[PDB]
């Protein structure tokens, strides 16, 4: 028994020779080894001592992955692994340059936020490959237990260390890359609040010494690149937002989606399906048809599923013996995916009087919006607003109605339509909840168009909060709104003057082909919407 | 005794054919044309790749639609052995971890 | 060899040789140590009481760190570490003067409240260094449990002792600088508010004999400088506000922000980015432009990120070899941070 | 060992002198006649009995009025051993009753543990913040408090570890609570309600002059000659800065003035510091209450 235990002690001691064990950790090993010496193999506590000491020896101490510090090589890896993402690539390149000047490895906390399917999770793997790091991914969205972060107590039966502690062994280095998913989706819980634990992780002062619940020793969590992914920044907790560096990843236009699908989505799905380029062919027109009709999202997550379905059916066809090679032409696309899911890009092809197209932004992505007005009845008029409008959205309608009445007095004094009539205002798709003052200027145009009986200029979309006197206030999600407007095939877009920075931060090709108008007062909007 | 009882290098032939696999599924269960079509595609891609473990298939739906019985039918389709990893309680060292 | 009982007992006894053990403390360990002699090593109860004895010996009974009582030395450290915030510095200076008149170490409970990013947490480390005191930091934000504050009985498995007990063990002294963060947003427990246990922690009369569930012996929690951090004093519990001293840390005007950025934010960011003063230079007007048009806030937390971003982009140019030296000017500031965020100050220039 | 360590029939030599008890109570606290009268009646009844006795008393009132501090003085006056129990935000029922001896490392309740260290079956148990006890779903220690605070059933108190009834009578139970509505009705009935009201501005001046300022001076180490606080300055501080029922706010303001004066003497700014109503704002800060009414003449 002792001889077998002696061999266990010797092999454990050999493992820790290479690790640079801290001063306060080696004594923990010595006392555990001493307890292992006086314990019998059949003792229940022997397994706990054997397992816990193994975990302490398994966790690296002072072992760092060999980082890559070549700007040219790292840039080439990033370009070949992903399309676009210039802002993300610029930050990574700057990260390498700073480490080169420092002369040693260092860590940072980064946040990527945008619509799902953009490539937030995939770029993390490419960054780790470019940085010669170890990639680890875990999610905290809808997570309420804090024990998962730091494990459980040693004395508890069937207890294991936390994911970060589990990360150290599998990565076998003290310089890994950690990815956190659905940070904006965390919520308050009765059993415990993991937000406090997340605050310590992302705090450069606090993360230098991290305390777990199994190992019960501080671990230097600094010099670790923390990357977190979210959909929106508003729902992220305020203390967590400060510790995180915000980097925005936007959606892709139809011309951008085809480039991604042609170079990345199709070859990846084809490779995992066991097919080759010669046997399975996907032309550009079918890929274009899939994007226009079979997909509506801003990302390419749904497009990937459609592509994988096509290759799955093609692989089955060749195996069954229908044909040695399958070509996915637009004529036989229905045999693979079926009838198109979306047949109309916009609900109103030609807007009747009282109908104005608007722009909306969500965590899902950009979207188009329509505002319809009608005469509810043939001393004082009234306005009724329908749809799942929020408190802020309903208030903006009241502001728009008041300004619309005042605007008509100074423009058409003889017109008393807005004061002596009952008008019903409805935003279609009433099932989906709506909120925000984004459509303030859209409501004014709809009320003015109905009162004057003049349809608004075709292919025109507008957004922006409107004040009581007519001032146009900036609105968020300009990038998402512009992408949705381009997908909807609009030609003229009206934006607040204070949002000029956000609009011009978009790519050159996205801006090209769009007649953008920047306004500060609604008086300029009136001329654009009603040229005559 | 347990060491010698574990088979090593002894494995029955798998994925005998595709037409017989389809016929086995049609006889085992009625309907599920969409579900059966997916299974045939899963078998076809596995044959092309040559690897048994391409990806894990998860069936979700209303209770009582015979999701469990499909795996038994699938095993007979490509000549495998069926086993059920049914779990009702999540315990670390009760089912998978083992003892000693 | 064959002295496992002796070695454990002798090692524990040696720990109390250099500590001023109170009468009520070493009386308890005597009955615990005698219980070890009559206990079997392989027994499960043996593990529980050995940990209890180890925890008892880990407490630094009567151990006081050599504090600094030099007014001139402490004032110089405080001035060189932070800008402004005279109210916090004045309280610390009076604390040292009282200690000099007292002739012995003393503890106080202080609370700093103000906007985020006004150096409330940063000066806590500076004060501890100036006072030559050990520093411990932990937060009570979203806290809805009482067990970590007090502890658990030895009967329960995995009985985590109180958090304060952990502070005394690592600091190895009875006069640390424990900072309580986010006391304003302490979780209101549906089953029970944990702030009730915090009252005993922050009650100067009750700090003399603080009882925790695990150790089961009172610990002299006096002579400890308790610092509390908060954003709004309204959400702090009323009984907790009575025992805590309110010190206000106001925000910074544009003039004050420029002084902080020029003297503290920029030099620290340069060291963090590994850039020399000559390699990257940020002019005063550039910093003024960043404060005016890029950071509309009371604190300087947002300004620190913008300053780091400019240096981070400058560091890339140096490494890439595009420019041997980088100088930031208002004309080319957009090349580093982009278009200004806040281009206007008021919606109406002339009010109708 | 636990069973034998219990002081069965061991009583401390209580002090039964009314004059001595009257003097001791007045050394540390001002006013509190209702609390002091109850203690005086407690001693008078014990003298008539010829033997020690126990009672259950609950002091309620505004926070910071002296409910917790007077308990220590009462034990010193009564020559009883002092033990303090905290139940604020407490949900562990076993801490009061105990645990079954079958469990490994089982221990008795806190009441039984207190008797062992006290070595006397006549202690003075003080329970703080019984009003805000933890009524969680994990446990309800307030329900277990009924057996602990039952005047008739205290003679036979059963704890899980010992499994033997212990005579918990002859014990003066003092309970502190800021409010009484949150206390359970069965628990409220068993305890005797004693109200400790707040102090008026006139009463606060007496407290500050005789108890707060001398204690602050000893705490700060500043002599009366070095820094002098007069009645008029103290009256101004109470009038415009300390309007709450308790004296905790007044204690901080008095400490602040002495703290500022201590720095001046230490720094060498002044050999002696004299405080006047003109200079009060410099030492303590901006006045809080200045306007007593917003209408001089009501329209
Ligand atoms: N398509 C089918 N063809 C033939 N028999 C079927 C079919 N679907 C279900 N059955 C029969 O109904 C029984 C009930 O199905 P089963 O118990 O497998 O459901 P399940 O999907 O495992 O349910 P649960 O969600 O409750 O776990 C099957 O065992 C089988 O006998
Ligand atoms: N009459 C008095 N004379 C002298 N000191 C007093 C008097 N009343 C209160 N104090 C002092 O005020 C402080 C607060 O007293 P204490 O802590 O007992 O209040 P409390 O009402 O029991 O508090 P809580 O309900 O918050 O626990 C103590 O320092 C005490 O000495
Ligand atoms: N620019 C791009 N270049 C290459 N692949 C991309 C690009 N954008 C998206 N993808 C692909 O689309 C998928 C997006 O899924 P993912 O980003 O993991 O979803 P989520 O953003 O919700 O985490 C990835 O698998 C990635 O391969
Ligand atoms: N007057 C100042 N002098 C130097 N640095 C300052 C000053 N004010 C703020 N800072 C810097 O700004 C940061 C503010 O963070 P801090 O306010 O301590 O966080 P919290 O709000 O959580 O307490 C600190 O890191 C500090 O370095
Ligand atoms: Mg089933
Ligand atoms: Mg009290």
Author numbering:
A (entry chain E): 410 to 787, 796 to 949
B (entry chain F): 463 to 562
C (entry chain D): 410 to 761
D (entry chain C): 463 to 761
Sentences copied from the publication:
The hexameric, barrel-forming, AAA+ protease Lon is critical for maintaining mitochondrial matrix protein homeostasis. A human Lon monomer contains a mitochondrial targeting sequence, a Lon-associated N-terminal (LAN) domain, an α-helical neck region, an AAA+ domain, and a protease domain (PD) in a single chain. The LAN domains specifically recognize and capture fully or partially unfolded substrates, which are then threaded towards the barrel chamber for degradation using the chemical energy from ATP hydrolysis. We determined high-resolution structures of substrate-engaged, substrate-trapped, and substrate-free forms of the human mitochondrial Lon protease.
The enzyme-substrate intermediate is resolved with the help of K898, which activates a water molecule for nucleophilic attack on the ester. Therefore, we introduced the mutation K898A (Lon^K898A^) in wt-Lon to trap the enzyme-substrate covalent intermediate of the hydrolysis reaction. We determined the structure of Lon^K898A^ in a similar manner to Lon^SE^ and the reconstruction revealed clear density for a trapped substrate in the protease domain. The trapped substrate is present in all six protomers, but its signal is approximately five-fold lower than that of the surrounding PD atoms. This suggests that only one of the six catalytic sites is occupied in each Lon particle. We modelled tetra-alanine peptides in the maps and they show a β-strand conformation with the C-terminus of the substrate reaching S855 ([Fig fig4]) and the N-terminus pointing towards the centre of the barrel. In contrast, the gate loop adopts an open conformation in Lon^SE^ and Lon^K898A^, in which the catalytic site is exposed ([Fig fig4]). Furthermore, reconstruction of covalently-trapped Lon^K898A^ obtained in the presence of substrate TFAM retains the in-plane six-fold symmetry of the PDs and shows substrate density in all protease domains. After the covalent bond between S855 and the TFAM C-terminus forms, substrate threading is stalled.
